Amino acid sequence: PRPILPSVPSWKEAEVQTWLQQIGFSKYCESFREQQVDGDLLLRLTEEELQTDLGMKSGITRKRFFRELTELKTFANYSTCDRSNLADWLGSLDPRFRQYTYGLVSCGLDRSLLHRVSEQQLLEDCGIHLGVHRARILTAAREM
Amino acid sequence: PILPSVPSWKEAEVQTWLQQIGFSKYCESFREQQVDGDLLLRLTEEELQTDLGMKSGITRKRFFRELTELKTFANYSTCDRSNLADWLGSLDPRFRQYTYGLVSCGLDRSLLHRVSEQQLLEDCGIHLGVHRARILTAAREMLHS
Amino acid sequence: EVPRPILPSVPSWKEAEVQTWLQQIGFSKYCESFREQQVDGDLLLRLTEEELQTDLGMKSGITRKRFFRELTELKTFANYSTCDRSNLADWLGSLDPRFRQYTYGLVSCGLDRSLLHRVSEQQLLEDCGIHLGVHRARILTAAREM
Amino acid sequence: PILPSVPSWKEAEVQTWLQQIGFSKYCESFREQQVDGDLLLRLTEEELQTDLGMKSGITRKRFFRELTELKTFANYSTCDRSNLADWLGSLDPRFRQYTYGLVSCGLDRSLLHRVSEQQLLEDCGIHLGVHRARILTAAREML
Amino acid sequence: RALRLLGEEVPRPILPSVPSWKEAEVQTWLQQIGFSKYCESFREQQVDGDLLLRLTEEELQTDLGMKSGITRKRFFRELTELKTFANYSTCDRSNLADWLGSLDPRFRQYTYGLVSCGLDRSLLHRVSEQQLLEDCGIHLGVHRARILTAAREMLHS
Amino acid sequence: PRPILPSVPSWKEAEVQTWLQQIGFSKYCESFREQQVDGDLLLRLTEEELQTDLGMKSGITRKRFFRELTELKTFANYSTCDRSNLADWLGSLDPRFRQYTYGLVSCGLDRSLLHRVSEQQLLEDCGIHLGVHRARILTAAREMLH
Amino acid sequence: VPRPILPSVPSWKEAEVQTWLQQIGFSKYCESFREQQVDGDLLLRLTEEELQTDLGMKSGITRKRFFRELTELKTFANYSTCDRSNLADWLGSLDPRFRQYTYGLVSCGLDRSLLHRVSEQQLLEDCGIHLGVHRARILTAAREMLHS
Amino acid sequence: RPILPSVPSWKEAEVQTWLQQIGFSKYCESFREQQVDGDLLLRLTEEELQTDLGMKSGITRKRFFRELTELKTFANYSTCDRSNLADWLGSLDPRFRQYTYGLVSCGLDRSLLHRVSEQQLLEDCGIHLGVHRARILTAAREMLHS
C-alpha cells in the first residue's frame, strides 16, 4: 500500500532508491545514486537539478516526477526538523499545503515567526511557486 | 451521452482518444511520455512541441481545438467538490474547459472571489484576456463568505 | 475577377474549399503545404504571420503581404452567420466596411454585442488579432458607447 | 502631363518603371516576388533588403529617392475619396508621398483629426518625426 | 581675418554646391582629401552630392568598406569641413544656413540635415530633441542643446 | 590537543584536505590542493568558484558540499578574527546564524558598527542570501545598544 | 621658435605622432598609427575602442600604459590655436590634472561662456570625461561661471 | 616583510621580486611581458589579472588580491599623497589604508574627500565593499578642514 508517515528528511540514498522503484522511476536510480540524493536533497530538488544533474530531459517526465514528490511531501513525517509542528498547521489550512513544510523549516521558520513572513520570502526562500497557495498561507499566517 | 472522467483517465484511454480525433500519428510519443488524463488536461504548447514532437503550430492548434472540446464535455466530479464546472458553464459553456486549471490550484467556489488576474493566467492557465476578465468579474459578484 | 463563390461561408469551409480558393487567388504553389497542414476554414481565418512563414513555408514577406491582401478581402465579404449570433459583422461593417474582417477574431474569443463595451485595447490586439492601431482605436471608441 | 495611377499598376508597369529609373538589375527579383502597384507603394526597407535582394543601404536610399518621386506625382483618385493627396500637398508638396499610407489604413479627411503619433509611424509608415508632427498639428486644427 | 579658405590646404573649389554634385565631383573631392583608396567604392555605390551629405557611419563601414573607426573619424572630419562651407541655396529657401551660422559657424554643417526633414525658419521653434537627433542627425548633445535653446527663443510673433 | 570548535579561519591546506576526506569529498582533494584552498578561502568559497575553479559540475553535489560547509561554519571558532564576539550575538538570535560570522567580520563589521548595516550590505558584502535571515539580522541590529 | 616647451599637439602631423610613439617606448605601434594616419587631432581624441580594434592594442594593461603617456601629453599641451577662451587655464586652476580635458571640451565648441549650461551627460558622452569625481568637480565649478 | 615600500615608484624589477616573495613566481613572465610596474600593480583589476596576465582561477585571483591588499596596507604613498590620506584612512581602520592609491589617483585629498559619493568610491576609486564605502563616506563628512 501507501507508506504511513515516512521520515523523508532522515532518508538515506537507499530509501530514496526504494521510493524511485515504487513510483516506477527505476530508470533514474542510477543518476540518483551517482548524485548521492538523500532525503534532504530529494525534498529540495529543483526543476534545474532534475533536468541537468539527473538527466530527466522531458518536461512531462519531470511533471510526473513532481506529482509523485508532492504526494510524498504531503504524507511525510517532518518531526526531526519541525519542532513547532508547522506540518499540522499547514495541513489544517489545506492538506495540500503540508508539502511546503520542508521549505519553511529549512529557512528556520516556525509557528512563532510565521506571522512576519513576506510574499517574496515564501516564493524565493521557501519555494512556494503557486500564487494561490502563497496568498492563502500569508493570509492565515497574519491571523494567528 | 456519457461525459468521460478525463481526470481519472489512464494512458490507454488517452491512446483511444488520440485515435478518435485522428492523431494516431502521435500515439507513440504520448505512450513513451506516459500521458494520462491529469497530464493531458495540463498539457502546454511547450510540452506538445518539445516533448511530444508536434513541430507545426498549425497542428498544435488543431490538437488544442480537440482538447478544448474534450475539456468542455468532461466529468470533473472526482476533483471538483464545489462544482466549479457548472459555475463556469453558466457564465459561458466554453468556460467549462477551465475547470481543471482552477481545481488544480485548490480553488473552489468560496475562494474564487479573492482570485487575481495574475493567478488566473499563471496558476490556472487561462490564456485569453477576454475569458480572464469575464471570469474575474463574475467571481467578484458572488457570495463573499 | 473576384474569387467564386462570393459571400462564402468560410467558417464552415473544409480543406477542399480552402484548396479551391488558393487556386483562384493564384497561390496554387502553396496548395500542397495547406493540404499537408490540413488548413480548413477555421484555421484559415485564424492564420498568423508566424504560421504562414514557418508551417506553410511562405518565406517572403512580400508574398505573405500578397496573401494577407487576399485573405483580408475574403474575410471582409464572408458569411459569419453560423458563428455570429449577435451580428457583430454588421456592427463592425456599419463603422467601416473594412472592419468586417475582424468578425471571426471577435466571435472566437466569445465576444458579442453585449460584451463589447468591456473590451480593452490589449484584448483587441492580443486576443482578437487587430494589428492596426487606427482600427483598434476606432473599434474601442465605438464599443464604449453602444 | 497626366500622373500615373500607381495604385492600379500591374507587374508589367512596375517593370517598366524600374527600367526608366535605372534599376533594371532588380527587374527579375520584382518579377519573382510579383510586385504590383499596391506592393510597390507599401514597400519597406526590410522587404527591399531581404526579399528583393538589395543588400546596400546606399542603393536602397537611391531606390527610395525614386519611389518618393513616384509617390509624389502619382494619381490616387481611385483610392482617395476625400482627396487627402491635395490636403497633404497643400501643407508641403513632399507630404503627398504619404497618401497611400493614410488611405491604406482607411483614414480620410474626417478621421484624420483622431490619429496619434504612434499610428502615423507604425500604421501609416511616416518615418520622419518632423513630418509626423506637422501632419498631426494640421490635422487637429482642421477639426 | 582668419580665412584659411584662401589657403592651399583647403579643397578646391571653395563654397561648392555639394547638393548638386554628381559622382565625378565626389570623386574629385575624395582625391583632394587623400581618400583615393575609396574612389572605387564610392563610384560603384553611385555616391552623389545628396548621398554624400546624408552618409552615415553604418553606410561608410558596411557599404563603402571603411572598416576602421579612426579612418571613418578622419573621413567625417573632412565631410564636416565640406558641409560647413557648402552652398545650400538650391535647397535652403529660408536660409537656415545663416541662422545656424549666427549661433556658431560650426553649426552650418547641420543645414542639409535640417532642410532634408522639411524644416525651415518658421517650423524651427517647434522642433524637439528627438527630432534633432533622429531626423537631423545631430549627434553631439552640446550642439543639440544649443540649437534647441536658440530655437525656443525665436520670434514667431 | 584537540579543540571542540575547529579554528577554521587559521586552517591550512592540510586541515582543509583532512576535512574533505571526513565529509566524503576525497574526489576533490586534488582540486583543493592545486588551488591552495586554506581556511580563509574555504570560508569564503562561492558557488562560482566551486563550479569553475574546483570542477564541481553538479548543482546537487555543490548543494551537498555547502550543506557540510554550513555546518562547519556554524560551529567554528572565530576568536582570532572576531574581537567583539559577533558569533555569540548571531547565535543568540538563532544558532544557525552563527554561520554568517566570517561574512560579517571579513567586511570589518563588529558589534559597535552593526547598527548601521543595510540590507544591501548584508546581501552583497556579507553573503547572506536568505531574505528571512537578512530581515531577522537587520531587525535585531537596529535595536542594539550603541 | 625651434623647440617649444609645451608641444602644440593639436597641430601635430603624422610625423610628430610617430616621433612621440618612439620616445614613449611604443615603436611597435608606429606602423599601425602610420597606416591609420593618426595626427595630433586624432591622437587627442583616441578612444579605448579605437586603440583596441583599429590600432591592435589587445591588452588592457598596454592600453593603460598608453593612456598614462597620453594623459601626460594632454596635460601639458599647448591648446592656444583651438582654445580662444582659455579653458585650459580654467580647468588647470581647479586642478592641474584637469587640463587634460581641454581638447574634449573645445572640440564640442564649448568655451568659458557656455560652460554654465553644460550637463553631466554632455561631459561624459560628448567631452569624454569618464571619472565621475572629475565630472562632479568640473560641474560644480561651472555653476559659478557667468553665461551670456 | 618590507618596511614602508614605495610601491607607486616601483619598477618592473621590484614587482618581479615581490611576486617571488609571495609565492607567485609562476606569474613573473606575464607581469614582465605586460610591463607591470608599481602604478599598474596598484591599479590592477580582476579583468586585467584574468585576461591580460592569464590568471584563470578565481581562487588564485583571490589569493593574489589577498597579498596585494597586504602590500597596499603597508606601502609608502608619500610621492603621490601630499595630504597624507594614508594615515587618515589608517586611523579610521588599518584595513582602509589599502584604498589610498585609488583615492589619490583620482586627485582626491583630505579636503576634497567629503564631496565624493558612494558610487564614485566604487566606480572611480575601486572600493568594492559597501561597508567600507559607507564608513569612509561617513567619516569624511565629519572631518576638520582649514
Describe the structure.
Chain E: It comes from Homo sapiens (Human). Chain E: Belongs to the SARM1 family. Chain E: Residues 21-85, 95-157 form the SAM domain. The structure is a homooctamer. With 144 residues, the first copy, chain A, is mainly alpha-helical. Chain A has two domains: 1-81, no CATH class; 82-144, no CATH class. Chain A contains nine helices and no strands. Chain A has helices at residues 13-22, 29-34, 39-43, 47-53, 59-74, 86-93, 101-106, 119-124, 131-142. Chain A is globular. The N and C termini of chain A lie far apart (36 Å). Chains in contact: A-B, A-F, B-C, C-D, D-E, E-G, F-H, G-H.
Quaternary form: homooctamer
Q: What's the helix count of chain A?
A: 9
Helix content of chain A: 40-55%
Q: List how many beta strands of chain A DSSP finds.
A: 0
Strand residue percentage of chain A: under 5%
Tell me the series of helices and strands of chain A, N- to C-terminal. Answer: HHHHHHHHH
Instruction: Tell me the major beta sheet of chain A.
Output: none
How many distinct folded domains of chain A? Answer: 2
Strand pairing plus helix content of chain A: what structural class? mainly alpha
Termini Cα gap of chain A: 36 Å
Radius of gyration of chain A: 15 Å
Shape of chain A: globular
Q: Biggest protein-protein interface?
A: E-G, 17 and 25 residues
Keywords (chain E): Cell projection, Cytoplasm, Differentiation, Hydrolase, Immunity, Innate immunity, Mitochondrion, NAD, Neurogenesis, Phosphoprotein, Repeat, Synapse, Transit peptide
Organism (chain E): Homo sapiens (Human)
GO molecular function (chain E): identical protein binding; NAD+ nucleosidase activity; NAD+ nucleosidase activity, cyclic ADP-ribose generating; NADP+ nucleosidase activity; signaling adaptor activity
Subunit structure (chain E): Homooctamer; forms an octameric ring via SAM domains. Interacts with TICAM1/TRIF and thereby interferes with TICAM1/TRIF function. Interacts with MAPK10/JNK3 and SDC2 (via cytoplasmic domain).
